[PDB]
Amino acid sequence: NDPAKSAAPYHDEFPLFRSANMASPDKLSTGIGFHSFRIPAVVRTTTGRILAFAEGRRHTNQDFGDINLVYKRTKTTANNGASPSDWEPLREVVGSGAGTWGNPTPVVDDDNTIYLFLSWNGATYSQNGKDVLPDGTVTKKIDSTWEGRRHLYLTESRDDGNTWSKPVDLTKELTPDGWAWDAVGPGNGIRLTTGELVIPAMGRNIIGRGAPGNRTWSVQRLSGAGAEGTIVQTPDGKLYRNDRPSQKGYRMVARGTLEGFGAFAPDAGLPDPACQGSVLRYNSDAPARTIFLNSASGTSRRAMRVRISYDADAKKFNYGRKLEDAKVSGAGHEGGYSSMTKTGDYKIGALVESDFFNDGTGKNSYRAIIWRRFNLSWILNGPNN
Numbered sequence: 530n531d532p533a534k535s536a537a538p539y540h541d542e543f544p545l546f547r548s549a550n551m552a553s554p555d556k557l558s559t560g561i562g563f564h565s566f567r568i569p570a571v572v573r574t575t576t577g578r579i580l581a582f583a584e585g586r587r588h589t590n591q592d593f594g595d596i597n598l599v600y601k602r603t604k605t606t607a608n609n610g611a612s613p614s615d616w617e618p619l620r621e622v623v624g625s626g627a628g629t630w631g632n633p634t635p636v637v638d639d640d641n642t643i644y645l646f647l648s649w650n651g652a653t654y655s656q657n658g659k660d661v662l663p664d665g666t667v668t669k670k671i672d673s674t675w676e677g678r679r680h681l682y683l684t685e686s687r688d689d690g691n692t693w694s695k696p697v698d699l700t701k702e703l704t705p706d707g708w709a710w711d712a713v714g715p716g717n718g719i720r721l722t723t724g725e726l727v728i729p730a731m732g733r734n735i736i737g738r739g740a741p742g743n744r745t746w747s748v749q750r751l752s753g754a755g756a757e758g759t760i761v762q763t764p765d766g767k768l769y770r771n772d773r774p775s776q777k778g779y780r781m782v783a784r785g786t787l788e789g790f791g792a793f794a795p796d797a798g799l800p801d802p803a804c805q806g807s808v809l810r811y812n813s814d815a816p817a818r819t820i821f822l823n824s825a826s827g828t829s830r831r832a833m834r835v836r837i838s839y840d841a842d843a844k845k846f847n848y849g850r851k852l853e854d855a856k857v858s859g860a861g862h863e864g865g866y867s868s869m870t871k872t873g874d875y876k877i878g879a880l881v882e883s884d885f886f887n888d889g890t891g892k893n894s895y896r897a898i899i900w901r902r903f904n905l906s907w908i909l910n911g912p913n914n
């Protein structure tokens with residue numbers, strides 16, 4: 530039995546990061562605009578304010594080149610981001626240089642310090658190499674040199690997201706030596722019942738211990754982990770990694786504690802097309818719930834489905850509800866990376882990528898990000914479960 534099913538279903542949805550092709554495209558106050566927005570992350574702070582982050586991809590939808598880390602906040606701590614007018618204009622966390630600032634992975638600490646882990650690479654490097662930049666420059670492949678590797682940066686805010694520190698490079702401390710490619714998140718980290726922070730990253734968790742907003746960091750290496758991971762604390766208090774697979778098929782799941790994890794294995798209940806997903810601890814009292822969101826397809830990113838598990842170890846999720854049951858118009862084809870938070874008014878708030886697909890899979894396809902709010906009742910009253 531879930532009493533939430535008896536509440537009135539609630540949903541609303543609208544574009545929050547508007548690509549350059551849309552009416553009223555999102556630009557910074559400096560006039561700097563963006564072809565595409567990708568790679569969402571969202572958190573609710575301890576005040577109730579919502580912070581939404583994304584990669585502002587300047588010139589194309591590509592993963593490399595000039596990409597800035599951008600964000601929006603709710604105007605007040607109490608408005609819950611319910612309508613477009615509730616959100617501030619686009620701001621920038623970091624945009625220095627013509628390199629890539631991305632993979633936003635925020636976590637809100639107990640003191641309300643908001644930590645934001647990020648990945649960086651140089652202006653003339655790309656994951657595969659030999660990619661053509663807008664000016665015709667051909668990229669070098671990301672490699673293990675200081676200049677050519679993926680870095681891990683940390684910034685934080687002490688004023689509810691209003692301002693951000695200059696990002697500090699933590700690569701030598703928190704990325705293993707000899708690495709070339711790297712990734713943190715993207716999506717979110719968590720705070721455990723026992724007080725530690727856990728931030729998911731490629732092949733590892735980053736663990737924060739000690740005083741809120743003055744944490745010491747260490748690395749928990751994980752055998753079999755993916756590049757793009759998610760982390761949740763399940764109702765049993767254990768840790769749960771749910772990672773993007775290297776090949777299309779299913780989410781890769783492992784369970785553990787701060788002392789170690791077991792093996793990663795595909796979750797046959799969670800089809801995935803090799804794309805990022807998101808996971809969220811909703812509540813701990815009966816009935817305890819974990820929420821999961823991804824594209825529920827072995828092939829397509831356009832099958833977004835939000836689900837609930839009542840299991841103490843999140844063994845099984847229900848069918849849930851397709852996001853297309855509450856479709857957004859005028860913002861392209863919804864589907865891709867996502868991020869979820871709980872809102873101050875007992876809703877789930879989700880950011881979800883969308884793709885106009887005007888250039889197909891090509892670099893000129895405009896990408897936007899949708900903001901959704903829905904309650905548990907909305908999920909539970911879905912026509913397929």
Ligand SMILES: O=C(O)[C@@]1(O)C[C@H](O)[C@@H](O)[C@H]([C@H](O)[C@H](O)CO)O1
Pocket residue numbers: 568592656712756757803804
């Ligand atoms: O939309 C994707 O699939 C994407 O390209 C977007 C990300 O910007 C990129 O960092 C990531 C990466 O390429 C894979 O995780 C393989 O390492 O995937």
Ligand SMILES: O=C(O)[C@@]1(O)C[C@H](O)[C@@H](O)[C@H]([C@H](O)[C@H](O)CO)O1
Pocket residue numbers: 828829830831862864865884886889890891
């Ligand atoms: O379901 C997919 O994957 C799709 O076919 C349709 C999506 O709307 C689009 O975002 C995506 C993307 O172009 C590729 O994943 C490579 O970037 O292509």
Ligand SMILES: O=N[O-]
Pocket residue numbers: 736747748749787788
């Ligand atoms: O610091 N490894 O739990």
Ligand code: NA
Pocket residue numbers: 595596597624625626627628
């Ligand atoms: Na930049």
